[PDB]
Design a protein around this ligand. Sequence first.
Ligand SMILES: Nc1nc2c(ncn2[C@@H]2O[C@H](COP(=O)(O)OP(=O)(O)O)[C@@H](O)[C@H]2O)c(=O)[nH]1
Ligand SMILES: Nc1nc2c(ncn2[C@@H]2O[C@H](COP(=O)(O)OP(=O)(O)O)[C@@H](O)[C@H]2O)c(=O)[nH]1
Ligand SMILES: [Mg+2]
Ligand SMILES: [Mg+2]
Lengths: 176, 179
Amino acid sequence: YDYLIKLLALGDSGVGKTTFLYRYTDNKFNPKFITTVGIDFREKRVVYNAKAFKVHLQLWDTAGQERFRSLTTAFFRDAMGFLLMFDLTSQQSFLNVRNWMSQLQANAYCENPDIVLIGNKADLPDQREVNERQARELADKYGIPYFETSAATGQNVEKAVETLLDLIMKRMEQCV
Amino acid sequence: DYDYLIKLLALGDSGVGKTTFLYRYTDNKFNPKFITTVGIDFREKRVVYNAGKAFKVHLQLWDTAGQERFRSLTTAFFRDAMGFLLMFDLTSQQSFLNVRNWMSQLQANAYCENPDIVLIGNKADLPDQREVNERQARELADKYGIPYFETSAATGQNVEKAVETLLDLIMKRMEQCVE
Ligand SMILES: Nc1nc2c(ncn2[C@@H]2O[C@H](COP(=O)(O)OP(=O)(O)O)[C@@H](O)[C@H]2O)c(=O)[nH]1
Ligand SMILES: Nc1nc2c(ncn2[C@@H]2O[C@H](COP(=O)(O)OP(=O)(O)O)[C@@H](O)[C@H]2O)c(=O)[nH]1
Ligand SMILES: [Mg+2]
Ligand SMILES: [Mg+2]
C-alpha cells in the first residue's frame, strides 16, 4: 500500500454506525479489541446520633476505568477522518451531533481531521423526522459535505466515505 | 431493621486509592459486581485514489461497541447517590487537577437533592512523593464550602473520619428536608 488511512464512525447509539461500516466494507471477519468495565457496592452498618439512627451505608466503586481509557485513546489515535453520523429518523440524534460539533476544538489546518456529516436511514422516508435543508445548514456552517445515506439500500455509502478520502488526501498533499 | 439506606460513591482517577479506601473502611468482603464488556474494532477496504498519479489507499474504519450498556451502567452508578467521596492522590498533581476540573462542571441541583461531597487527598503516608500543595487543595475545598481530609487508605488515617463527616452532612441535609 501507499497510504494507510484511519477513519472513525462517530454518532449516538442506534444511529446505524455498525450497519454503515458493514455495508461499505463487507468482509467476512474483522478484529475486535474488547474489555470488561463495571461498578460494584459494599455495605456497612453504622449508628448515627442526630436520635441514635440505624444507618445502612452502601458504598460504590467503578472498575476498569484505565483499561477503558486506553481503548478510547487507541480508537482516536491517528484518526484522519470522522464519519459523523446522525439518524435521519431521529431529530435528537441530529441535535446531539450539532451540540458535539460546536464544543469542538479548532486545530491547525494540518492536525484537523476532516469531517463528513451523514444523515443515515434515508430508506425509511415515512419515519423521517429531520429537516434536510436544516442538515445542509450545519454542513455549510462548517464547510463540511453532507450526504443522505442508506445502510440498507447502499445509497451514498461508498460516495460518503470517498468524499472524506478526498479531503484527507488533498490535506496530506498540502502538509507534506 | 435499618432506618436509612445511604448510597455513597468513590470518585477519582484510577490508581488514586478508591477501591483500597473502601475496603479499608468497611472491613468486610461482601461486594456484588455488575460487569459489562465494551470494545472497539475496525474494518478494511482497499481503495485506489488519484489526485492524475494513482495511490493505493488502505482504508481502515473504526467503530465502538457497548456504548449504550456502558451509559446505563454509569446511570445506575449515579442513581440516588447522596454523597461523593471525592478523591485524589496527593502524589499526583494530575489526579487533583482532574478533580478540580470535574468540580467546575458539576451542575448544582435543588438544595435537598444536592449530593454532599468530601474532598480527599489520599496517600498521605508517602510524604516523600507528595506533589499536591496543601493550600491549593484547601482552596478548592472552600471554593465549594467542602470539608477536606488528607487520608491514608494504607493506614486508616482519617478514612473513618472522612466517611463519618460525609454521612453527617447527608443526615443534616435530611433533617432539614423532612416533611
Ligand atoms: N432500514 C434501515 N435500517 C437501519 C439502517 N442502518 C441501521 N439500521 C437499523 O437501525 C438499528 C441500529 O443500527 P446500528 O448499526 O447498530 O447503529 P449503531 O449503534 O450506530 O451501531 C439496527 O436495527 C439496524 O438494523 C439503514 O440504513 N436502513
Ligand atoms: N501508599 C499508599 N498506597 C495506596 C493507598 N491507597 C491505595 N494505594 C495503592 O495504589 C494502588 C492503586 O490503588 P487502588 O485502590 O486500586 O486505586 P483505584 O484505582 O482508585 O481503585 C494500589 O496498589 C494500592 O495499594 C494509600 O493510602 N497509600
Ligand atoms: Mg454499533
Ligand atoms: Mg479500583
